[PDB]
Amino acid sequence: MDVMNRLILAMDLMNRDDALRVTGEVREYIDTVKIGYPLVLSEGMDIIAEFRKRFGCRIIADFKVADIPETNEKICRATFKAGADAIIVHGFPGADSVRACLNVAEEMGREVFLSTEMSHPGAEMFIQGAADEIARMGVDLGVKNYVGPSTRPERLSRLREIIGQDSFLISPGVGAQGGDPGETLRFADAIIVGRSIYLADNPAAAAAGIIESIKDLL
Amino acid sequence: VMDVMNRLILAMDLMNRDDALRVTGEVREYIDTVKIGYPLVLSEGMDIIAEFRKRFGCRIIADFKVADIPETNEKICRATFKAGADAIIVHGFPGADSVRACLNVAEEMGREVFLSTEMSHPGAEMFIQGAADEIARMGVDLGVKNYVGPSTRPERLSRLREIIGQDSFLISPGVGAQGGDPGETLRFADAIIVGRSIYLADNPAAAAAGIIESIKDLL
Ligand SMILES: O=c1cc(O)n([C@@H]2O[C@H](COP(=O)(O)O)[C@@H](O)[C@H]2O)c(=O)[nH]1
Ligand SMILES: O=c1cc(O)n([C@@H]2O[C@H](COP(=O)(O)O)[C@@H](O)[C@H]2O)c(=O)[nH]1
Structure with a gap:
């Protein structure tokens, strides 16, 4: 994806x-x-x-x-x-x-x-x-797409280890919940962002700002 | 309740x-x-x-x-x-x-x-x-009054009833299609949840009436 x-x-x-x-x-x-x-x-x-x-x-x-x-x-x-x-x-x-x-x-x-x-x-x-066992269950079942936590990058890293580099991993908890966009993208393919964009005074500027902060990762 | x-x-x-x-x-x-x-x-x-x-x-x-x-x-x-x-x-x-x-x-x-x-x-x-036992205990600690537990495992339903106490309200699915028995389940649950046994029956009203007849002495 x-x-x-x-x-x-x-x-x-x-x-x-x-x-x-x-x-x-x-x-x-x-x-x-x-x-x-x-x-x-x-x-x-x-x-x-x-x-x-x-x-x-x-x-x-x-x-x-x-x-x-x-x-x-x-x-x-x-x-x-x-x-x-x-x-x-x-x-x-x-x-x-x-x-x-x-x-x-x-x-x-x-x-x-x-x-x-x-x-x-x-x-x-x-x-x-x-969670590690759930991830292994996914692997056993042939699941290719996973969700894990921006708020715990050490856990997100472990989950990436379990599922491998071929699997697709997305991660919420960025912004409002405290997760960092760039750090999260060390492990996840994509970040999920809600309130930091949709409750912002200027949602377009908020989205632009996040993207600017991860520009080297795109 | x-x-x-x-x-x-x-x-x-x-x-x-x-x-x-x-x-x-x-x-x-x-x-x-x-x-x-x-x-x-x-x-x-x-x-x-x-x-x-x-x-x-x-x-x-x-x-x-x-x-x-x-x-x-x-x-x-x-x-x-x-x-x-x-x-x-x-x-x-x-x-x-x-x-x-x-x-x-x-x-x-x-x-x-x-x-x-x-x-x-x-x-x-x-x-x-x-x-599940800890989830139930957590519910009790949080002041939860209403609970759902499994008809298909009477021993577990019994234990969960003990944890939440007799004053709590307990409803239980898995009756009929999944194998649970109405009467046995009502030993522990206040009410049973029934889906397919009723809604897929040729006569859902007769199916419901039959279930109720089977638990008549528990009403
Ligand atoms: O572990 C999870 C899994 C989620 O799907 N989510 C979802 O991701 C979104 C996070 O939004 P927000 O950036 O406003 O915190 C919400 O829709 C939430 O339901 C989450 O926050 N944590
Ligand atoms: O442990 C549970 C919890 C449920 O809510 N349910 C729900 O109870 C109903 C059981 O329906 P049925 O009698 O057709 O098996 C379904 O709506 C199911 O989603 C369950 O079967 N087991």
């Missing part, structure tokens, strides 16, 4: 007008948008097609899929029907649940991203201790 | 509005509590909650397995309660801050959180099972 400027916008505004306007403002800097439940549950699944119509961007549906296999399959089908290019899936519920998502993604020509370790403090309680 | 008619919650995971409405209407005399998840919501919109409220006298539990960072969890809970859900189901494995974010919104908005403890499917044995 070829992400422009190694920068994925996390579009978590919850109003259609603002989400479309802000995405429009930074469109020259990105070609990949992560859309999650804050926007989808506020404005409907039709928002995905709208983004494709307006921007042509790729859409990663960050739905943290985390149910039993049968339900996971349904969630993935509905999500890809809406035009998402990829979906993010939790590993903590185990291999059968991940495989259910992989099957639908294969059927519809899409990609699954596996959540390994999350970026927030609570991730230390249960997720962190399972 | 919510007063669940016949101790039976319908898991309405049909993805077509017409079928979902038809089946729910057919079983309405037996069930006043419906669990609506992402299969239906992502197919038909959050307005499906509004439509169920309009058509049926049913409480709505939004089974959204909320499993993000605290900031995103808050946004998901707010959107879900705004749409009219009485309660939302949240994962515990992302940790206490993520659960607390949901509890805070629920408190502010006058609604309820249900905490997933151990899940019912085989994959739950890999990571969730080993964390």
